[PDB]
């Protein structure tokens, strides 16, 4: 799902004729690094957007009904005394949320994320300055090391005719 490992659905014909449609696990380097790049960019963008939402003022939340209330809708729900904001349903004096108190906490979380992800961005800086060969199932077999002797998976690839996907 995170595209770190690709799967190959090749079935071969072993000499005992008890063939099964085995799956081959391998890595597609450019697809994997693009997935990693997209994931970290969406992580930092979502954290920045959460920081922006935390930059919004605190607002309110009615503890009886457990519903948030922004500062804009608090003014439409203030009392005749002009002193307290009352809930629409519970008719309870609104208590303040913490949108802004944790804003510095979210920024420090972003800072502690940023130096930890720094080797990843350094690696992507060195990769973006270089050329990545788009490996596939055939390319990955060039640097293959077999793990066990009696391997039922025959790594020899079988091309076919008629497949036009």
Residues forming contacts to other proteins in the complex (CB under 8 A) are 57-58, 64-66, 71-73, 75-76, 78, 81-85, 88-90, 100
Among 45, 55, 57, 61, which Cα is nearest to 105's? 55
Q: CA-CA distance, 54 to 104, in Å (whole number)?
A: 9
From Zn ion, other proteins, none, interface partner of 58 (C-beta below 5 to 8 A by class): other proteins
For the bound state, the minimum distance from the C-beta of residue 48 to other proteins, rounded and expressed in Å, comes to 20
For the bound state, the minimum distance from the C-beta of residue 89 to other proteins, rounded and expressed in Å, comes to 6
For the bound state, the minimum distance from the C-beta of residue 54 to Zn ion, rounded and expressed in Å, comes to 23
61 binds Zn ion (CB under 5 A): no
Report the residue number, 4 or 64, with the smaller CB distance to Zn ion: 64
Rg (CA), the chain: 28
Q: CA-CA distance, 32 to 26, in Å (whole number)?
A: 11
């Amino acid at each position: 799902s995170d595209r770190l490992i690709s799967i190959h659905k090749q079935r071969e014909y072993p000499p005992n004729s008890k063939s099964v449609e085995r799956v081959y696990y391998y890595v597609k380097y450019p697809h994997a690094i693009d997935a990693i790049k997209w994931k970290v960019h969406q992580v930092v963008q979502r954290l920045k957007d959460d920081l922006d939402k935390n930059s919004e003022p605190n607002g309110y939340m009615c503890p009886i009904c457990l519903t948030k209330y922004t500062q804009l809708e608090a003014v439409q729900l203030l009392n005749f005394d002009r002193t307290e904001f009352l809930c629409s349903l519970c008719d309870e004096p609104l208590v303040e949320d913490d949108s802004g108190k944790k804003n510095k906490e979210k920024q420090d979380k972003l800072n502690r994320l940023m130096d930890q992800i720094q080797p990843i961005i350094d690696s992507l800086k060195k990769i973006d300055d270089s050329r990545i060969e788009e490996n596939t199932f055939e390319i990955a077999l060039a640097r293959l090391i077999p793990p066990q002797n009696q391997s039922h998976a025959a790594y020899t690839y079988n091309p076919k005719k008629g497949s036009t996907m």
